[PDB]
């Protein structure tokens, strides 16, 4: 069985789809037309891929309306491949089998279904090979497209939709993919696909052609009788001319295109051809037949998302290793200039500069954290519609294994290198306080980065706003301007500065109990005014409270900022347009 | 006349072109084959577009070797359009006529030739309209490609080369462009072009087909005889099949492609088909016929390049206005925080911070200056090979009207806003010294930016290197670390820092003659040690000379850096690969 039907389809975004009828039988159903037509807009309506606000038709499966889980039981092959190149083919479709299937069955059955899919699709030669990223090379485009096709074949879908499987391919492998689809349909399985500029070498395989032009249906019926249909309408197909291009030239309406026939008789272009089809025998025959008629837990889908993210991170050691190396060299260099901090007139300047630069670098290093939910936006939307996971599990999985371990490490590397090469404060607690403050600053900057770019499609706009925001955050830090000299109507802006919160904690940790005047005991009293001989005087002059609360409130503020920004990012992901 | 011939062509980069022969007669000569074949590599050999090191053939025009100025007298239409979208069609080809022609003829003759070209080509409806950038919209693709065709038609070339005029177009305007080319060739003019996946609607227009596969010639002769040639070789063309795709399927070698003929008899794939052609009648007939056989001044091309660059800059008020607005906003904000600089203990910190931030911003704002010779690399290379200008005139024209006026303005805007809203030093000379120093810092940063990215094809690599270089330059400025406490083996690195040179001059200008202790006359003597009550003490503590030479040597160093970086950039442009 598995016969799809759609009656009186009307979609309004500007009505982009006028009255459309048709029955897709088990076979190889193709949708053709120009790019601006309803060719692509009808595939996403037949599958539950568009918002039902504008759909005014009636679509049925075996004469009954489609259930709620129709998207979970019907594969959809996205045009652009969204397979992760870092993992292998077997691991990619193993991840798919671990999510779309049920947890009642053991891993042996999931693996045997995986083996059956790769054997039927012909993926045994490159079963255990990497797909391939841009830096590293793997399988060719045909194998990647076949892997993407097999990704949704795991749950043995009854109906399979494809959005232009030929685009982005070459002439040699397009017929291979089409023959694979035809052989798959020979057992009997509805296959509905969009097609762009086909060849006659693949046109003969179609069993039901649907022609669309500017939202108007122009032909529907057997694909082998379309050429005769348009021949009997007064359009001759020249010899050695593609019938698909022959249809498209009529659809566009090129005068230099095919010539007319001879007329024996006894609305510029687009509404005459639709009107011709309306009063045709195919329309009456179609209308008579038309009128005759979660699964996985939260943890189970958190572990798998986190594992896939970790494998993606470790599979391409050029984004983690590059920043690790640059952090290591930056720490060694900074230790080189600031070697041997002295307790003299120049000690305060050096300490303030080295503590400010570390915080500024820790804040500016999180600008590149916008590649978390942007480079994976299309793939994420596809997983969410398909029925893989929910937003919370994806958000936590991409957080535990992508941001958590790649942000803690640079702070540790900076602190264990620059500390003893400088000689800040030889105490056990100060070292850990500095490490903790750097970790919090990095985490807060990364959380704000995720909050800003949580559903955007490009990075050229999030990064510029991020940089312009961090510049103002750096202005209100405490070194470039004295925070006690700000006007009352502008001093409040300092409370929205992450670098200020980190820098204040670092300074309060470093400057407590230090003398900066050789041979002058200012601890008892200061015989000279305008002296700043003692570290406490510098902290008070900078507006920093000397109590331990004046240290820990910085971390309290940083944690509050982390929570607010993470919640904002999760809400932005939750209310994303999923269609 | 104007008949092109090429005999025993052999090109070695791996020999990419084996023995190739052919005569291109006045007509519509097409080169066909797969992407990896010599389809594109032969067009750039027939025209003087490849390095003659590897060419081992013999190419002739009317039976004589081509002269040195062959590239100046033969149009070449680049595949991707390099027309400037900001200018209009009439202005674009007016710029072309003003450079590619001679200056003996008045402007009236150049203009009438311009009119004749736009009339012959049919560019009168959109003659005075803008081509169209990505933000603003103008003419459509077909007329843009036609404008690009007309750009090199100004000098009435005898031979015209085109690199895939159909690619990047649609099925409607491709036939229009091909018909335009055929109509142009009807008067008689050799037109040689590469073609990718044509249709039979345009195949009938060809007069000489040249089939290439992996550098081996597979057919050459009349285009209408190719289908019969391959039919007599044992390959049948199925009905309703494109002859071009019929040839390409044989060339690639698809088994699922067209079927074989019946054989009446009484080297895997590629060396048998070529060998068939070697001992064919077409080869003998071709071989018998084969064996039978600056202008403008420097100133005239400087003014036009500068005028075009200025028109491009003013055509899209989105790159200049954006930075102008952000500079105006930043100046007002900075004047807001730093309002009313006091002569107290916090005056030194505020002055140092505000003078450091301005220099750092002026340095970091020149990172976006790598879009000068990167986004226009292809256009520059094309116009240099074609013979529009020389490297010096292009370099100076893109310097006088693109970098000079867009870097001087932000310094003036910053200086006239933040100065009096702060109250740095109420003197006439200090204002101009600050403006001059900011201008020099911006110019030096921009010149180093140009020196780094002067021939690269992308910006993702130059910007990262420049950012990491400016971070180190900012480290050795004088505020984050005391320059007198550096180790002797690392102190020399400070001499390669533009921000340090600017900041030292600004500080020497601001801190000379200031007292920072209320009620303490430290000008006579300092009764208290560790006081830094006087501005001169701060300058000496920072390692800055107090002589006026200690101010002007900074500008001397900045000017020297400007000259060195500009020369390096010009040399990098001069030795670029122009093929």
């Amino acid at each position, epitope marked *: 069985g598995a016969v799809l039907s759609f009656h009186n389809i009307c979609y309004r975004v500007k009505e982009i789809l006028s009255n459309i009828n048709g029955i897709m039988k088990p076979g190889l159903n193709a949708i053709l037309g120009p790019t601006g037509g309803g060719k692509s807009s009808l595939l996403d309506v037949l599958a539950a891929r568009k918002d039902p606000s504008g759909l005014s038709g009636d679509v049925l499966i075996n004469g009954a309306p489609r259930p709620a889980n129709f998207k979970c039981n019907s594969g959809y092959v996205v045009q652009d491949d969204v397979v992760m190149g870092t993992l292998t083919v077997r691991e990619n479709l193993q991840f798919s089998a671990a999510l779309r299937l049920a947890t009642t069955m053991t891993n042996h059955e999931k693996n045997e279904r995986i083996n059956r899919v790769i054997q039927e699709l012909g993926l045994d030669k490159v079963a255990d090979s990497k797909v391939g990223t841009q830096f590293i090379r793997g399988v060719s485009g045909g194998e990647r497209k076949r892997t993407s096709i097999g990704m949704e074949l795991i749950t043995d879908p009854s109906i399979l939709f494809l959005d232009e499987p030929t685009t982005g391919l070459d002439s040699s492998t397009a017929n291979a993919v089409l023959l694979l689809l035809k052989r798959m349909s020979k057992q009997g399985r509805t296959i509905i696909f969009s097609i762009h500029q086909p060849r006659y070498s693949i046109f003969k395989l179609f069993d039901s052609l649907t022609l669309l032009a500017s939202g108007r249906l122009m032909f529907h019926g057997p694909a082998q009788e379309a050429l005769g249909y348009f021949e009997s309408a007064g359009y001759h197909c020249e010899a050695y001319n593609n019938p698909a291009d022959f249809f498209l030239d009529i659809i566009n309406g090129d005068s230099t295109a095919v010539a007319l026939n001879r007329e024996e008789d006894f609305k510029p272009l687009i509404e005459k051809l639709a009107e011709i089809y309306v009063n045709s025998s195919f329309y009456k025959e179609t209308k008579a037949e038309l009128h005759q008629l979660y699964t996985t837990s939260f943890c189970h889908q958190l572990r798998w998302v986190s594992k896939r993210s970790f494998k993606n991170l470790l599979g391409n050691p050029q984004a983690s290793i590059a920043q690790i190396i640059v952090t290591v060299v930056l720490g060694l260099v900074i230790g080189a200039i600031y070697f041997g901090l002295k307790n003299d007139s120049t000690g305060i300047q050096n300490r303030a500069g080295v503590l400010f630069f570390l915080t500024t670098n820790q804040c500016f290093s999180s600008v590149s954290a916008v590649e978390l939910f942007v480079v994976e936006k299309k793939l994420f939307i596809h997983e969410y519609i398909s029925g893989y996971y929910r937003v919370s599990s994806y958000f936590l999985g991409k957080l535990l294994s992508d941001l958590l371990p790649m942000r803690m490490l640079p702070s540790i590397i900076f602190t264990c290198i620059v500390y003893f090469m400088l000689g800040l404060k030889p105490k056990a607690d100060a070292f850990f306080v500095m490490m903790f403050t750097l970790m919090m600053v990095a985490y807060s900057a990364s959380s704000m980065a995720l909050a800003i770019a949580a559903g955007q499609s490009v990075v050229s706009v999030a990064t510029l706003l991020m940089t312009i925001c961090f510049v103002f955050m750096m202005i209100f830090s405490g070194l470039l301007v004295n925070l006690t000299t700000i006007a009352s109507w502008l001093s409040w802006l300092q409370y929205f500065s992450i670098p200020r919160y980190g820098f204040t904690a670092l300074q309060h940790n470093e400057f407590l109990g230090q003398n900066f005047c050789p041979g002058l005991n200012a601890t*008892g*009293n*200061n*015989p*000279c*005014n*305008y002296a700043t001989c003692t570290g*406490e*005087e510098y902290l*008070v002059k900078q507006g920093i*409270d*000397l109590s331990p609360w004046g240290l820990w409130k910085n971390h309290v503020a940083l944690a509050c900022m982390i929570v607010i920004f993470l919640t904002i990012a999760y809400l932005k992901l939750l209310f994303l347009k999923k269609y | 006349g104007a008949v092109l011939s090429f005999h025993n062509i052999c090109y070695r980069v791996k020999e990419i072109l084996s023995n190739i022969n052919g005569i291109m007669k006045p007509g519509l000569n097409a080169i066909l084959g797969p992407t990896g074949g010599g389809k594109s590599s032969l067009l750039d050999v027939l025209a003087a577009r490849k390095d003659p090191s590897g060419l081992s053939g013999d190419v002739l025009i009317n039976g004589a070797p081509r002269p040195a100025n062959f590239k100046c007298n033969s149009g070449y239409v680049v595949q991707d359009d390099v027309v400037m979208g900001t200018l209009t069609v009439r202005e674009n080809l007016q710029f072309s006529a003003a450079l590619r022609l001679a200056t003996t003829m008045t402007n009236h003759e150049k203009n009438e030739r311009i009119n004749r070209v736009i009339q012959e080509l049919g560019l009168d409806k959109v003659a005075d309209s803008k081509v169209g950038t990505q933000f603003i919209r103008g003419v459509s693709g077909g007329e843009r490609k036609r404008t690009s065709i007309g750009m090199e038609l100004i000098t009435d070339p005898s031979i015209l080369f085109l690199d895939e005029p159909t690619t990047g177009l649609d099925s409607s305007t491709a036939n229009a462009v091909l018909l335009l080319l055929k109509r142009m060739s009807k008067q008689g003019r050799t037109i040689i072009f590469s073609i990718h996946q044509p249709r039979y609607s345009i195949f009938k227009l060809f007069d000489s087909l040249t089939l290439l596969a992996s550098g081996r010639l597979m057919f050459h002769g009349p285009a209408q005889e190719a289908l019969g040639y391959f039919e007599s070789a044992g390959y049948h063309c199925e009905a309703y099949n494109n002859p071009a795709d019929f040839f390409l399927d044989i060339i690639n070698g698809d088994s699922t492609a067209v079927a074989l003929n019946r054989e009446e008899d009484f080297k895997p794939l590629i060396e048998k088909l070529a060998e068939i052609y070697v001992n064919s009648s077409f080869y003998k007939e071709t071989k018998a016929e084969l064996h039978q056989l600056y202008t403008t001044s420097f100133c005239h091309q400087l003014r036009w390049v500068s005028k075009r660059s200025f028109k491009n800059l003013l055509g899209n008020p989105q790159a200049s206005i954006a930075q102008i607005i952000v500079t105006v906003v930043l100046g007002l904000v900075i004047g807001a925080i730093y309002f009313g600089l*006091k*002569n*107290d203990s916090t005056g030194i910190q505020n002055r140092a911070g505000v003078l450091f931030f301005l220099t750092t911003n002026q340095c970091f704002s020149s990172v976006s200056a790598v879009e000068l010779f990167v986004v226009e690399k292809k256009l520059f290379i094309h116009e240099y090979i074609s013979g529009y200008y020389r490297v010096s005139s292009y370099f100076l024209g893109k310097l006088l009207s693109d970098l000079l006026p867009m870097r001087m303005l932000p310094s003036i805007i910053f200086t006239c806003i933040v100065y009096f809203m702060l109250g740095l030093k109420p003197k006439a000379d200090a204002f101009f010294v600050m403006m001059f120093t900011l201008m020099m810092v911006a110019y030096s940063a921009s010149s180093m930016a140009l020196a780094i990215a002067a021939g690269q094809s992308v910006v993702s690599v130059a910007t990262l290197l420049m950012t990491i270089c400016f971070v180190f330059m900012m480290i050795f400025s004088g505020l984050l670390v005391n320059l007198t406490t550096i180790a002797s083996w690392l102190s020399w690195l400070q001499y390669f820092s533009i921000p340090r040179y600017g900041f030292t001059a600004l500080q020497h200008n601001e801190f000379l003659g200031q*007292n920072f*202790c*209320p*009620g*303490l*006359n430290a000008t006579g003597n300092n*009764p*208290c040690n560790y006081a830094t009550c006087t501005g001169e003490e701060y300058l000496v503590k920072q390692g800055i000379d107090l002589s006026p030479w200690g101010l002007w040597k900074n500008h001397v160093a900045l000017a020297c850096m400007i000259v060195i970086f500009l020369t390096i950039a010009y040399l990098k442009l001069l030795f670029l690969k122009k093929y």
Partner: antibody
Amino acid sequence: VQLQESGPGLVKPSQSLSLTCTVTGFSITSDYAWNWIRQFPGKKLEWMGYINFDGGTTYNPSLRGRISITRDTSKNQFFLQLRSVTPEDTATYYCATFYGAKGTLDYWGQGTSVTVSS
Amino acid sequence: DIVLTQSPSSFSVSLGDRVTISCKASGYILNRLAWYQQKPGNAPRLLISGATSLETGFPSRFSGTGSGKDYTLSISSLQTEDVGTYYCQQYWSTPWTFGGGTKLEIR
């Protein structure tokens, strides 16, 4: 070293008040800062503002644009102008000196009781 | 600003006793507090500078201690020429604020 106060003692309300402190024994442009302290009709003290030895003047935020201190080198004095006087501004005004290197007010003046009445 | 407060507005002590005048601060003064003594009908003479030291012309009966936000002035063996009003003034920030008032009154 020695300071002397001078000025009126009866200023009409909503008017301008002008006082003068004469310095003898030291130069007003040499080293110190010169202040004005008013003691209210009670036992409170308030620092109004001071002038440096070069001409820099710093005022109290409480007197929003009501106080202006101007010095004359020839007679070695500094004068105080307080505009828009009010009935409740009935303090006695001392002119003290500020060392700076020590931070405390060493020498003072006799003071004058200023009455604001109709 | 920095508000200087003096908890005892008025004292009732006798001759030859230990008088303790304590005054706290809103912010951190950092040993920049000075004590002043005013007679009933004279200028306020300066007693202690630096909150610990002591100026010439005064006996050693006066002592100044304290660090952080609060400072104390101690008078040992109070005699009859030590009455008046005592003030503590900070000179950390520019708006110099004096204390309250401690007018001694013997019985």
